């Protein structure tokens, strides 16, 4: 259980550096809940001074009892050589992520539906809050699990399932690995009062998700099998470079009728050299060509 | 979704060729096209019209100022600028798409003929009284 890890605990790394072969190195837990290497990724890193280099990735980080505590992922090195700063993904996050892949082949990503940021000492002063660290709730989305739970903005999350929270970024990573419908409990702090709440993860689009490389255009289904309407378009993007504009409604592609995103994706699965979209702007019917 | 195959009987090599063909024909020229829709041969009678947008380049009127297309606007409502290219002699003096030339050198301008009429005078400096949005401005030349 990676949640029992404490800075100071001894760690042992096992991997294949430079293809030399199974190589074992040792160290200690430098720090926990490290993140920021890639703001878009779910990262709650364990940091260790245990030697890790090119090849160790996917390797095991274990404690003195040989139990897996994390998976060595990246290092901070200006020269491409270890300098005593390595990061590993906590065993718990792996436990959660793999168990899903085993069953679904992917991860059912759920959310609480809350906006927020890191609670620093400055922000604590303004909000008359005691804790100098945690998740500060900017706002709660309507019809979200959190809303239903009774979470209000200006709240500070301090714990998750009993385990204290290092930061907002950590909490994001925690729940970011849990399967949809997972029942969990949060420790909140509003007006210097401790609160406990029971939650349950819920379900939670861009054009890059369907064309694999075409960004700057959001789109979704239209009514009931009326095609794929484009919600919004950004300027200076790969999508608008082919003509695409917000308000268009994709009727079909390559002589195949398109009622929803599933049918559209089924034409792309065929992987044709050139894609011909039969969209409709206002009263007119037009075509858009790709490749 | 139609495919044009012939022009006035003569087969079409490419879209680019067709573009060049008609691009040289005078307005109102009556011509016929050979279409192909649903594996079905179609014939149609057409007549070239007055292009509302991208009607005329600017180098054709200022003799040396490229990168800006413009045409007449509605009914003697001035010369509106259709489109402007970046890094061109035109935009170098300020000209931007959407502008509507009301007059030049204190002479009213209703259409391209009137405008060219002022340029025939060949003044040392040209002062265009254009209008962007609800504002009225001037653009100076030379």
């Amino acid at each position: 259980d990676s949640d029992a890890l404490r800075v100071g605990d001894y760690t042992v790394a096992i991997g294949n550096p430079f293809g030399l072969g199974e190589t074992v190195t040792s160290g200690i837990v430098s720090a926990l809940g490290r993140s920021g290497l890639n703001a878009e990724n779910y990262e709650n890193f364990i940091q260790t001074d245990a030697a890790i280099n090119r090849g160790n990735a996917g390797g095991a980080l274990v404690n003195l009892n040989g139990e897996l505590i994390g998976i060595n992922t990246a290092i901070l090195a200006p020269d491409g050589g270890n300098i005593g700063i390595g990061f590993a993904i906590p065993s718990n996050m792996v436990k959660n992520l793999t168990s899903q892949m085993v069953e679904y082949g992917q991860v059912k990503r759920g959310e609480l539906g809350i906006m927020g940021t890191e609670l620093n000492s400055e922000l604590a002063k303004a909000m008359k809050v005691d804790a100098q660290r945690g998740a500060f709730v900017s706002q709660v989305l309507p019809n979200s699990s959190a809303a239903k739970a009774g979470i209000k903005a200006g709240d500070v999350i301090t714990s998750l399932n009993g385990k204290p929270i290092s930061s907002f970024a950590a909490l994001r990573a925690q729940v970011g690995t849990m399967p949809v419908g997972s029942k969990l409990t949060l420790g909140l702090l509003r007006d210097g009062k401790q609160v406990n709440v029971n939650l349950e993860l819920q379900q939670s689009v861009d054009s890059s998700s369907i064309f694999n490389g075409i960004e700057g255009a959001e789109m979704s289904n239209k009514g009931k099998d009326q095609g794929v309407v484009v919600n919004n378009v950004k300027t200076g993007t790969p999508a608008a470079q082919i003509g695409l504009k917000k308000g268009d409604v994709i009727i079909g592609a390559n002589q195949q009728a398109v009622k929803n995103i599933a049918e559209l994706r089924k034409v792309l699965d065929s992987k044709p050299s050139v894609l011909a979209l039969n969209i409709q702007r206002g009263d007119s019917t037009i075509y858009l060509l790709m490749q | 979704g139609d495919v044009i195959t012939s022009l006035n009987g003569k087969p079409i090599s490419s879209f680019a060729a067709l573009r060049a063909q008609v691009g040289t024909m005078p307005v109102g020229s009556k011509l016929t096209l050979g279409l192909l829709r649903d594996g079905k041969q179609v014939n149609v009678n057409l007549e070239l019209q007055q292009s509302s947008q991208n009607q005329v380049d600017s180098s054709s009127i200022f003799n040396g100022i490229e990168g800006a297309e413009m045409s007449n606007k509605g009914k003697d409502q001035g010369v509106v600028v259709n489109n402007v290219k970046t890094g061109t002699p035109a935009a170098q003096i300020g000209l931007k798409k959407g502008d509507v030339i009301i007059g030049a050198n204190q002479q009213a301008v209703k259409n391209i003929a009137e405008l060219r009429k002022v340029l025939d005078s060949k003044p040392s400096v040209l002062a265009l009284n254009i209008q962007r949005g609800d504002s009225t401005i001037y653009l100076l030349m030379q």
Partner: peptide, 10 residues
């Protein structure tokens, strides 16, 4: 290349 001596609109 060539030297002097996208949907287009027709």
């Amino acid at each position: 290349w060539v030297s002097a001596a996208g949907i287009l609109q027709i």
